[PDB]
């Protein structure tokens, strides 16, 4: 057990879901701090909780300090793409007035809510500037995962994450590509990866 245990380490949620993430210790803290960190940025302080048992609200975010001052939770109502990021809890533990210890964080991914999944693989037209044939897997449910792979000539991407600032056309996709002649979109996006009822329209 670490001085500060954050759970869960990774969280993938859909737009409009509520969520709670936890910061737990066997040590009593005089105060706990929450930071948010975005890619290409330093952590930014959100709030500090100081009074045992207290709640602090920062818009859609609610922070609770446990009564025994060994715990803190961060609750988000109606998750938005803008909520995506790393949530760190920190405190002066292990004999420190000046040195903060940072928990490992919850890395929050906010995925689109897809009411009517319509999973499909589209063969794209070649680019004049590349020798690659590209296949677009799109319109799948946010509970469907695609993990990156290289299997000989065939590359598949991890499924993409919404631009944090996206306010429309929020959908799931992964791509596959190969430079081999006669590349088949069905080769890359096979039954181990995609839903069985995935649609394969001809060009």
């Amino acid at each position: 057990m670490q001085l500060l245990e954050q759970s869960p380490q990774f969280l993938s949620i859909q737009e409009g879901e509520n969520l709670t993430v936890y910061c737990n210790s066997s040590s009593v803290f005089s105060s706990l701090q929450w930071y948010r960190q975005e890619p290409g940025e330093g952590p930014v302080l959100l709030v500090t909780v100081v009074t045992g048992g207290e709640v602090k609200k920062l818009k859609r975010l609610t922070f609770q300090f446990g009564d025994a001052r060994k715990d803190s939770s961060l609750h988000i109502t109606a998750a938005q793409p803008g909520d995506t990021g790393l949530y760190l809890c920190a405190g002066y533990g292990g004999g420190s007035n000046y040195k903060l210890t940072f928990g490992k964080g919850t890395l929050l991914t906010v995925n689109p809510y897809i009411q009517n999944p319509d999973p499909a693989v589209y063969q794209l037209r070649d680019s004049k500037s590349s020798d690659k044939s590209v296949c677009l897997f799109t319109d799948f449910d946010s509970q469907t995962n695609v993990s990156q792979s290289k299997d000989s000539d065939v590359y598949i991407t991890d499924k993409c994450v919404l631009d944090m600032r996206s306010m429309d056309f929020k959908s799931n996709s992964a791509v596959a590509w190969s430079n081999k002649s006669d590349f088949a979109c069905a080769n890359a996006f096979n039954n181990s990866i995609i839903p069985e009822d995935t649609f394969f329209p001809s060009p």
């Binding site: 964080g105 680019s127 590349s130 994450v161 306010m167 056309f169 929020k170 329209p201 001809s202």
Partner: protein, 241 residues
């Protein structure tokens, strides 16, 4: 505000370098962290005040100085591959609540040879007529390939304005040659608009990859262009049905 420079940096193993950190506020306490996958934020060095410096938890290969209150530089005398990391300078707030204010990070990549550094090639792939027919939506695919290190920012531009709506980007680049130690990287992104918007040949679509490369101080002796910090773009125009 904590100011860190540079934001991105490439060095060969063994060539001394300094990352600067200065704070406008008058704070006594400043510190350096590195952030690595699975290892959280690890304290390298801290300075309680002017001319006071103390090794953190992971000091080996680093030095600091605190001649002035305003500046707390991080010195790598002999950079090694293992010092490839994201570095954060922190200063301690003096209010009732002693939180930290952080710089915007320095992404340092330490390389065996500068000849391993390559800018991206960038291609755009136009929306499928099959997608347009099935969905009345149109997805453009941007593919950035052949870049090293993995120091890129991909953006989408429609009619000369950056867009965010309809943008979905791979959360990290993939290695093109993962069996090899010096693999270059690929990264994809999608921009989705209505079929109507795509079908308007006045509409212009550009995928931009900002690559963070070599600086002026870096020596270059290869035939191919010095891979300096640059944008590489690919474009498409709307296509009438």
């Amino acid at each position: 505000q904590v100011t860190q420079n540079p934001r991105y940096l490439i060095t060969v193993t063994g060539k001394k370098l300094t990352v600067t950190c200065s704070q406008n506020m008058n704070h006594e306490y400043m510190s350096w962290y590195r952030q690595d996958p699975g290892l959280g934020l690890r304290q390298i060095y801290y300075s309680m005040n002017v001319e006071v410096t103390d090794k953190g938890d992971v000091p080996e290969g680093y030095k600091v100085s605190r001649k002035e209150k305003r500046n707390f530089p991080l010195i790598l005398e002999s950079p090694s591959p293992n010092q490839t990391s994201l570095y954060f300078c922190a200063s301690r707030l003096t209010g009732r609540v002693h939180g930290y204010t952080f710089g915007s990070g320095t992404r340092l990549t330490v390389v065996e040879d500068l000849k391993n550094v390559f800018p991206p090639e960038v291609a755009v792939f136009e929306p499928s007529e099959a997608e347009i027919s099935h969905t009345q939506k149109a997805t453009l695919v941007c593919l950035a390939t052949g870049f090293y290190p993995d120091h890129v920012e991909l953006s989408w531009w429609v009619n000369g304005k950056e867009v965010h709506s309809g943008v979905c980007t791979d959360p990290q680049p993939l290695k093109e040659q993962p069996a090899l130690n010096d693999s270059r990287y690929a990264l994809s992104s999608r921009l989705r608009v209505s079929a109507t918007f795509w079908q308007n040949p006045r509409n212009h679509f550009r995928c931009q990859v900002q690559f963070y490369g070599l600086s002026e101080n870096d020596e270059w002796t290869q035939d191919r262009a010095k891979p300096v910090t640059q944008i590489v773009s690919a474009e498409a125009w709307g296509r009438a049905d």
